[PDB]
Amino acid sequence: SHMCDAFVGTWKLVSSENFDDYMKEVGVGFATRKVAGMAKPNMIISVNGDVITIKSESTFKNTEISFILGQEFDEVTADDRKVKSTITLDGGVLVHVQKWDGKSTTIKRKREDDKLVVECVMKGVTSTRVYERA
């Protein structure tokens, strides 16, 4: 079906802006913010039929989620939140909403030129993380 063809691949983080404030807003403690903020993850995105898998490999944590668009799932985040996640495709953007403890954060993943841009939003705080092909 070629859904998400442009996202598929191996991507390496090259820049991050305002991620400390994002993590604070989400509730991440001091030490975890410091160590997570250093990391330069490899994000590996693959598709097999209707199932999308996004793996993140880094010095901090390795994470993996597999999901079907529109179908809620359980996720344990890198900072150990136990969240309920739903990922949809809206106008070519992967939109990932995480719900936990009456809170919500949204992570958007977009293809821009040869980059994959990740925008993380919690209340009024945004962080932008830019990935290039690995």
Ligand SMILES: Cc1nc2ccc(Cl)cc2c(-c2ccccc2)c1C(=O)O
């Ligand atoms: C989207 C996201 N949200 C987070 C929230 C809190 C903390 Cl501490 C970490 C993350 C991370 C992350 C950062 C560094 C290495 C590995 C994961 C990511 C991610 O880039 O995949």
